[PDB]
Design a binder for these strands. Structure first.
Ligand SMILES: [Zn+2]
Length: 252
DNA sequence: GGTAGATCCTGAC
DNA sequence: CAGGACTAC
């Protein structure tokens, strides 16, 4: 799920778990647990704590408990569900939080790429994976000025820049490609080659694209098909190790 | 210190 | 072989 989807998850999941107390934590793929490194310590510390809140930073979910915070990233295909402990688990369920009311918060992930970190709440923001996270794309903290500053000081492509979580929080591949198309900028352009006008336009489109989503595609996954603006076949290449889609006429 | 590379997994082609 | 986010040149 991307940022907009994660925000939806945060909004919808909260009322389903708030006020519930953890009685057990069951882990079927320990590698998901990143801190404490020992999955048994992870499980033990959470028992007895009540869920008090749920926040989002970038694509990370932050579960607020009594003492600790649980920081969770779903990556490509991670999913949470709340269901009865009496029913069989769905396939690919790797972590389950059991509540005293007989309900469960279940984490599924066919790819097993998701991660979980638990720290005392006051530490969470100064530890991985939240430390160094850039500003929210929809916040004043993410401005053309901030974007321009990062762009001038790097030799990387503009796409590589936008994918950098330290530059802006949780801007996914799909939104990078879409934003770059809407701003009329080639993904392979050196970040430092962008004019002040192009930086301004890009920031504008980044906010509009992600902002619309939290509330059709031009290029992403449309390779070989006609551009919706000019009819030129959309092309796909690799930039910054990622599938990269663009229109060679609309983008320069 | 900045930046590329290795890292994980597995359904899919 | 793509996908998001610690090690070593
Ligand atoms: Zn076009």
């Amino acid at each position: 799920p991307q940022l907009p989807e994660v925000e939806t998850i945060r909004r919808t999941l909260l009322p389903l778990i708030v006020g519930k107390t953890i009685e057990d934590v069951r882990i079927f793929w320990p590698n998901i647990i990143r801190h404490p490194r020992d999955s048994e310590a992870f499980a033990a510390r959470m028992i007895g704590q009540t869920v008090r809140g749920l926040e989002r930073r970038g694509k990370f979910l932050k579960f607020l408990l009594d003492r600790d915070a649980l920081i969770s990233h779903l990556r490509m295909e991670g999913r949470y569900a709340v269901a009865s402990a009496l029913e069989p688990l769905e396939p690919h369920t790797h972590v389950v939080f059991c509540f005293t009311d007989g309900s469960e918060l279940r984490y599924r992930d066919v790819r097993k790429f998701g991660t979980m970190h638990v720290y005392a709440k006051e530490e969470a923001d100064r530890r991985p994976p939240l430390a160094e996270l850039g500003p929210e794309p929809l916040s004043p903290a993410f401005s053309p000025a901030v974007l321009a500053e990062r762009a001038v000081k790097t030799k990387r492509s503009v796409k590589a820049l936008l994918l950098d979580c330290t530059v802006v929080a949780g801007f996914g591949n799909i939104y990078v490609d879409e934003s770059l198309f809407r701003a009329g900028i080639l993904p392979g352009r050196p970040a430092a080659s962008l004019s002040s006008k192009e930086i301004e336009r890009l920031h504008e489109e980044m906010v509009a694209t992600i902002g619309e989503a939290v509330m059709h595609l031009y290029v992403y996954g449309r390779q070989g098909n006609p551009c919706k603006r000019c009819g030129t076949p959309i092309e796909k290449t690799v930039v910054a190790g990622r599938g990269t889609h663009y229109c060679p006429r609309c983008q320069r």
